[PDB]
Amino acid sequence: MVRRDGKFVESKSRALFVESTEGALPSESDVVIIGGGIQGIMTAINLAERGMSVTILEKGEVAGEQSGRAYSQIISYQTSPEIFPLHHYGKILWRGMNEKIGADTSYRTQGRVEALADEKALDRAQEWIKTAKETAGFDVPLNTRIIKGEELSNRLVGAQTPWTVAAFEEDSGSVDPETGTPTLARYAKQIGVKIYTHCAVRGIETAGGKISDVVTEKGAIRTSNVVLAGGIWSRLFMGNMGVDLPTLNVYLSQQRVSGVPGAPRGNVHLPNGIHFREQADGTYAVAPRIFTSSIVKDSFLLGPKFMHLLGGGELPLEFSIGEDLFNSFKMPTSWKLDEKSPFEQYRIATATQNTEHLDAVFQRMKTEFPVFEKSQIVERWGAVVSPTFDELPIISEVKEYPGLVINTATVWGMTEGPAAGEVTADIVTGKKPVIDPTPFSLDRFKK
């Protein structure tokens, strides 16, 4: 039967609290950034370090939404050719991040073992590793290989299933999302970025093809350069300017369980639906296999491109239908800049957690690794993501509105954030980007 429990709700941040910059909004800024997630913040840092004045506006709290809620494995494994450099260089930048900011983001190089279920999986793993090893950029080699026997069994200590082979990304990363983006926000503030929380951006004023200001709920700020890094809210923001972003929301759930003696370390991914990541604080992040699509207005508006999230393919997908459906039609898609926007109602949006999903993955984890019988649940939460239909982010200028640049629509933003932040800064400043952004352009959606 069809579920009725998936719901979009207002919530609170689960990430470390970041104080707003003191005082009034500035009257002008060289660049204004909409959103205080990892993309807004990493973009701000790259621009500030180039000597520009930068202001971030955040309707709720820093890392209140996706960036504070992520499973947060930092990996390149099985990425496409267009995406791989973003992940490969993301990892490079993360490895230098604590040094850069003189603080601990919680980033750790920990390694990731993915058990492979059969020869077909093994074939696909070896094929990707072969090509990635040959094409790895930025004068840094890939450190991903196949392992087996004694080596694998000790990596997967106490495992009840006879796993024989696995892809091992030895330099995979981990960052605890409660810690990472907030600590980067603090660094941003130290280098002169101004961050104003509880401050929604309603829209952008422009004429003659030049942006003149952004309008917030607390006043306007003059600028000719704007970055929209609004996460799931980017589509809605752009719809009010007559531009369509093809993104569809998906609901997820996550948890933390306590560490136990004799548990495997680092990052484990098994094909029988078991995925955990040891955190810097001793607890384990645990991710269920499944996602839910709550049926809403945009499910019909974007459906043809998104059939892999709406019943086609064999992704682990569950439909849900409820209050969301009717609310999605009541959600305004345009508003004047002098009236209240939907951003001022859902300052810290999330989805209701699915307890059944979280219980099921944890039980599967206890069966496969009996030491976790003595582990208990530390924390549980829900989250919303909003990918494009083509497995590519939107990192692009907006031709219609010179001065506007978008950096959004990724489900790998923890990994990509540092790299995407630099690319976005390059687009803003007119520098030849560190990674060619053609594949991430809005041009791919025209005609």
Q: Which residues of this protein are in contact with ligand FAD, per CB under 6 A?
A: 34-40, 57-60, 64-67, 69-73, 200-201, 229-231, 233, 237, 252, 254, 343, 383, 385, 408, 410-415
Task: Kindly state the smallest distance separating residue 58's Cβ from ligand FAD, in Å.
Answer: 5
Task: Kindly state the smallest distance separating residue 56's Cβ from ligand FAD, in Å.
Answer: 9
The count of other CB atoms within 10 Å of the CB of residue 121 is 16
> Please, which residue, 74 or 142, has the CB nearer to ligand FAD?
74
Task: Kindly state the smallest distance separating residue 74's Cβ from ligand FAD, in Å.
Answer: 6
Which residue number is nearest to ligand FAD in terms of Cβ? 37
> Please, which residue, 165 or 274, has the CB nearer to ligand FAD?
274
* Both tokens assigned to 147: 């392992």
Task: Kindly state the smallest distance separating residue 162's Cβ from ligand FAD, in Å.
Answer: 27
> Please, which residue, 11 or 410, has the CB nearer to ligand FAD?
410
> Please, which residue, 361 or 385, has the CB nearer to ligand FAD?
385
> Please, which residue, 231 or 439, has the CB nearer to ligand FAD?
231
Rounded Cα–Cα distance for residues 322 and 183 (Å): 37
Report how far apart the first and last C-alpha atoms of the chain are (Å, whole number). Answer: 39
> Please, which residue, 229 or 270, has the CB nearer to ligand FAD?
229
Task: Kindly state the smallest distance separating residue 107's Cβ from ligand FAD, in Å.
Answer: 12
Task: Kindly state the smallest distance separating residue 38's Cβ from ligand FAD, in Å.
Answer: 5
> Please, which residue, 68 or 439, has the CB nearer to ligand FAD?
68
Q: Which of 212, 181, 223 is nearest to 25 (CA)?
A: 223
Task: Kindly state the smallest distance separating residue 31's Cβ from ligand FAD, in Å.
Answer: 15
Cβ within 8 Å of residue 126, ≥6 positions away: 146
Q: Which of 153, 127, 163 is nearest to 270 (CA)?
A: 163
CA angle, corner 346, sides to 17 and 226, nearest 5? 75
Task: Kindly state the smallest distance separating residue 202's Cβ from ligand FAD, in Å.
Answer: 7
> Please, which residue, 39 or 299, has the CB nearer to ligand FAD?
39
Task: Kindly state the smallest distance separating residue 71's Cβ from ligand FAD, in Å.
Answer: 4
> Please, which residue, 335 or 370, has the CB nearer to ligand FAD?
335
> Please, which residue, 66 or 283, has the CB nearer to ligand FAD?
66
Asked if residue 305 lies in contact with residue 389, where contact means CB atoms within 8 angstroms, the answer is yes
> Please, which residue, 165 or 249, has the CB nearer to ligand FAD?
249
Task: Kindly state the smallest distance separating residue 14's Cβ from ligand FAD, in Å.
Answer: 12
Task: Kindly state the smallest distance separating residue 417's Cβ from ligand FAD, in Å.
Answer: 7
